[PDB]
Amino acid sequence: ATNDERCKILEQRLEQGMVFTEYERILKKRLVDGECSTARLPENAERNRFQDVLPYDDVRVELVPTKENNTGYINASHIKVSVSGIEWDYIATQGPLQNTCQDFWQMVWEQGIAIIAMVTAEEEGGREKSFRYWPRLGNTVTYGRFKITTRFRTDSGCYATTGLKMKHLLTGQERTVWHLQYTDWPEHGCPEDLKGFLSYLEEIQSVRRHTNSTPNPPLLVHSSAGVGRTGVVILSEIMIACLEHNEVLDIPRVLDMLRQQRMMLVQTLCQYTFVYRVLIQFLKSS
């Protein structure tokens, strides 16, 4: 029940408004070896949603080079953290563009991805935040050598689960990909329903566990920019796992480690304070 001491500390820090000082001291990106030269190539300009939100060279997801994409470039970062003995493996990526759908599915295939955690809407405020890279039911699409079929979509209130089949058109191999989309989460803000977000995290945790039981692949997390709401998901799941290991909690240490793998994770104070609220409620129900 040492979680009780953690929950008081967290509630007090939030209640007294000491969260901000902690958050604003965390650097947004690497100080050194922060080169994003491949991402900055003129040839890759159309592949970035924002020319300043970029993967670092040494952790970018490298696609096998193709005719259409010689550098095999996608705006996506490997995120590998070890926190309290747990080795976490994610890929964090931006929302696909019309012209990066083949790249996105090539990454899904090559990296062995079984679960997509989508935490953006397709459209918000009249703007595209993610291209519709998977088919709409009523049910198949082809991007280069990958055929994607939507089997079903089931709504769980705050999020929806879509069963996808992905087929390699040159080998005939097929794989199931589970698409878990949180549907009401404004960009730069927080989920509307805190408990709904916890149930979304619970479903990601469950499906990862059970698909692993049947080299485990990274979880693919994406938003629009691939840093804000993506960062909330990753930092929340890591910190929740920390709650069982007695070791002293150090959220800004963890977020700093994460931003060493992909810049700008967790864009706003409300997103960071939301992670505190998530942990408090998780501990309040333990």
Author numbering: 878 to 1015, 1019 to 1094, 1100 to 1171
Can I see the authors' text?
In the 2.0-Å PTPPTPN21 C1108S structure with a phosphate ion in the active site, the electron density of the phosphate ion and two nearby water molecules is well defined. The water molecules themselves are coordinated by Q1152 and Q1156 in the Q loop as well as E1067 in the WPE loop. It is likely that WA2 and E1067 as well as WA1 serve to stabilize the phosphocysteine intermediate after P─O bond breakage, and what we captured in Fig. 3B is a product-complex conformation. The invariant R1114 residue is held in place by electrostatic interactions with the inorganic phosphate and E1001. In addition, R1114 forms a hydrogen bond with the backbone carbonyl group of W1065, which helps to maintain the WPD loop in the closed conformation.
However, many of PTPN21’s biological functions require its catalytic activity. Combined with biochemical analysis, we have found that PTPN21 PTP is weakly active and is autoinhibited by association with its FERM domain.
